[PDB]
Amino acid sequence: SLAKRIYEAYLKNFNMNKVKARVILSGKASNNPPFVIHDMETLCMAEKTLVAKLVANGIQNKEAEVRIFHCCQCTSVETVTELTEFAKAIPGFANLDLNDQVTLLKYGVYEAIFAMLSSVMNKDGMLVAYGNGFITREFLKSLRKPFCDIMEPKFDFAMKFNALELDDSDISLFVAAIICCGDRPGLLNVGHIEKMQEGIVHVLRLHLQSNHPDDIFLFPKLLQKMADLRQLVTEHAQLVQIIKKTESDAALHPLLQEIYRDM
Amino acid sequence: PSLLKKLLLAP
Ligand SMILES: Cc1cc(C(=O)O)c2c(C(C)C)nn(-c3ccc(Cl)cc3)c2n1
């Protein structure tokens, strides 16, 4: 029953999942549908209702790219928080030494974040602000460097990942496998984590066989996606460092600075 | 006491 427990922990811990996202993306969000953000005007219109207007410590008159940065990084901070609670529900994770728990989360969270982000993306754009905004892919590309270069590789990954047509039961196991990865630099109990990995990967393999009998090669496809994600994160981290060094008004949250530091 | 450790040390 490991597959069911992990799926249950996923539904319990993440505010957004693919069922909830496709409901909004299909135009069925009756009360509070998403604000469509496709230019500077509709960005400002959306921010009027979706972001609090502080008096001094405010993002109101910062550059548009920086306002989007702050919204995106705050969502990531919450997803990291949710991923930590999710990891604790993975059987065996809580008995690891604390430093190994940190290392797994340190290197895993952004691979999981960009995997799960695919669920709120389609070819035209992505949900933001807890399902209450939809920002177009073209608008993001129209911004100035280096901010216009951040999301495009994530949209590219998401298009091919979404083409596999996974559901939340699949994704929950995939994210657990990302987290319980015996390959991370500086891990201590390598052998035990490799066995946790093997156990979760095994449950994933069996689950894909039951859930996707039409694609008997789905599992190696997903192994390749894990390697794609690790490369996607290493390249993303380089963009993050550029912004941390050269963008004065883009103050990185201390939790994200800790995650990216020495990664 | 790092921030990730704080998250992990939660109840
Ligand atoms: C989905 C996402 C995640 C991150 C993340 O690493 O947690 C991020 C960042 C880091 C630099 C904090 N920046 N952005 C981002 C900023 C401006 C624009 Cl226009 C598009 C994307 C980001 N988006």
Side-chain angles (χ1 to χ4, degrees):
Chain A
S1 81
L2 186 62
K4 170 187 145 296
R5 291 203 296 284
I6 285 164
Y7 185 24
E8 279 180 358
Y10 172 98
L11 292 177
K12 208 198 87 162
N13 279 292
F14 298 111
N15 72 82
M16 183 65 62
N17 61 44
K18 196 164 180 173
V19 161
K20 283 165 75 165
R22 291 294 179 84
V23 163
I24 295 159
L25 291 172
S26 74
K28 300 310 125 66
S30 189
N31 210 42
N32 298 126
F35 290 81
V36 180
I37 298 174
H38 69 83
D39 57 12
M40 292 295 186
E41 188 266 279
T42 54
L43 176 68
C44 292
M45 182 61 179
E47 291 172 312
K48 270 193 193 168
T49 39
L50 294 184
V51 310
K53 294 82 183 50
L54 299 191
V55 181
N57 314 334
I59 70 176
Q60 284 71 60
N61 253 278
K62 263 112 182 175
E63 211 169 345
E65 287 81 354
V66 178
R67 304 199 308 264
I68 294 173
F69 160 85
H70 199 53
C71 179
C72 282
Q73 80 165 332
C74 285
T75 289
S76 288
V77 167
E78 316 310 327
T79 310
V80 168
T81 305
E82 299 178 345
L83 277 161
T84 300
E85 295 302 301
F86 173 74
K88 290 170 176 179
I90 302 172
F93 186 88
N95 287 340
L96 306 179
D97 292 311
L98 183 68
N99 286 314
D100 278 351
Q101 298 180 358
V102 166
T103 294
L104 291 182
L105 280 176
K106 182 184 183 63
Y107 289 92
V109 285
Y110 270 104
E111 301 179 6
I113 282 172
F114 295 134
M116 288 185 304
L117 208 61
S118 306
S119 302
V120 310
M121 288 173 165
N122 60 27
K123 64 176 195 74
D124 299 324
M126 65 181 292
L127 298 176
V128 289
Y130 302 90
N132 297 287
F134 179 86
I135 183 156
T136 66
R137 183 174 183 182
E138 311 104 80
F139 175 63
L140 294 173
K141 288 215 315 303
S142 77
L143 307 178
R144 71 162 178 88
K145 269 83 164 63
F147 299 101
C148 59
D149 302 317
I150 300 179
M151 292 307 298
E152 194 57 31
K154 288 62 168 186
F155 275 105
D156 291 336
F157 173 92
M159 295 309 101
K160 294 187 69 60
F161 192 78
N162 289 345
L164 302 174
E165 289 290 334
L166 305 182
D167 60 37
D168 287 311
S169 76
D170 306 318
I171 299 168
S172 65
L173 290 170
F174 184 72
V175 169
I178 287 171
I179 293 166
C180 299
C181 170
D183 196 18
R184 305 308 195 175
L187 277 184
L188 306 164
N189 202 340
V190 184
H192 172 42
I193 299 178
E194 287 186 0
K195 288 297 185 171
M196 283 178 56
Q197 179 177 23
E198 185 174 13
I200 295 176
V201 167
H202 189 78
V203 161
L204 174 58
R205 189 178 322 126
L206 283 170
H207 181 80
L208 299 177
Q209 167 181 329
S210 300
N211 201 24
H212 294 275
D214 57 308
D215 187 355
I216 67 171
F217 304 106
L218 180 59
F219 178 67
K221 296 179 190 169
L222 281 179
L223 290 182
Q224 187 187 50
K225 297 300 177 194
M226 304 180 69
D228 294 354
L229 282 165
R230 187 177 299 193
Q231 183 65 27
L232 192 72
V233 172
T234 61
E235 304 172 346
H236 178 77
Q238 291 172 351
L239 254 292
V240 174
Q241 168 66 14
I242 287 179
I243 292 163
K244 183 196 89 179
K245 170 173 252 171
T246 68
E247 295 294 338
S248 45
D249 252 347
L252 207 53
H253 189 285
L255 174 57
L256 305 188
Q257 201 165 104
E258 176 181 324
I259 285 166
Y260 285 111
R261 199 167 185 89
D262 299 306
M263 189 188 71
Chain B
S2 81
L3 302 168
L4 270 176
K5 268 178 178 165
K6 281 222 188 75
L7 301 176
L8 287 167
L9 265 335

